[PDB]
Amino acid sequence: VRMNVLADALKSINNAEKRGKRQVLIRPCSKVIVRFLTVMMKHGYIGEFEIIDDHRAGKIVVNLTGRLNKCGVISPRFDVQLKDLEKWQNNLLPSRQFGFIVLTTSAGIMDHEEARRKHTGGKILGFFF
Amino acid sequence: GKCRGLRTARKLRSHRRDQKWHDKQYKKAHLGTALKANPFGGASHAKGIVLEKVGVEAKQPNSAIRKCVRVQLIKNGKKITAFVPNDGCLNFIEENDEVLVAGFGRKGHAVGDIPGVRFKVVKVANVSLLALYKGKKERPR
């Protein structure tokens, strides 16, 4: 059965990216998914998206720009201290000039560079470059 | 695929134990099955009695045949063939003498060396053959 709605959302965006699609439909929606998509949009990787309100868990239609190489999830959500952050960057991100790791911290959901500025750790959600 | 759950340490530990036992090097090292595998019974050298000189008794002047001797190891009674390093070191060795034997030929066999001989003579009467050849020591009787 389905156990990770964020994993399914990221995989479908990844596959639509490879096939040259301009729009992708992901269901079900989730506030974790919306927060993750917002982080990707601020760095210019996806673009604007729409949340469709049915009375059962929602759907999202996402516009695609063609700039995405790889988006993925990390399972299980490992606990990441600030001292461990550099090791995770080298394992998941090919370059130090682009790509981000998305964390869920007690101050909110942010990218790993923002987490270092706020001096906070948390749990790892995924990555994109 | 294998389990990638957060609470799966016990399952992962059992897999690594099984993988260790499939390693033939790990089993042999921990069970001690091959401690006595080598012809010297786990030692680096051995002592033997010089039986007779096969190369000299035959009249071939090859000088690769001539430096082969037969010795019997004291520890287990096996009979082996060893090399004398140089022709003229045969003169220092007599029959029924006690010699020290080391291994030879793990790297390989040179041109002009007989394949299948894996031993060499190093000492006679606890004196190195090179010292006797160079005239630095005398053989005690």
Binding site: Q23, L25, D54, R56, K59, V61 | -
Partner: protein, 82 residues
């Protein structure tokens, strides 16, 4: 493949798709007013009825359940509601 707008499907596209596969789910069933023959009382009947519906006035059989839709008796008139 053909280029479709996922955000703006046409009316012909959504009425053709399966009811669970639309952007927002919607049933294909409806309620109707049926007028009994012999006495002209009006009865509200579900389109995909699973029970035999009797006229309240005279207990006349108005419909009989089938696999997909209830078949109506001869001589009655019906109107969709809403």
């Amino acid at each position: 493949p053909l280029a479709k707008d996922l955000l703006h499907p046409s009316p012909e596209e959504e009425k053709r798709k399966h009811k669970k596969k639309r952007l927002v789910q919607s049933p294909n069933s409806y309620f109707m007013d049926v007028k009994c023959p012999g006495c002209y009382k009006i009865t509200t009947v579900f389109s995909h009825a699973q029970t035999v519906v009797l006229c309240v006035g005279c207990s006349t059989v108005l419909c009989q359940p089938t696999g997909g839709k209830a078949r109506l008796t001869e001589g009655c008139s019906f109107r969709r509601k809403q």
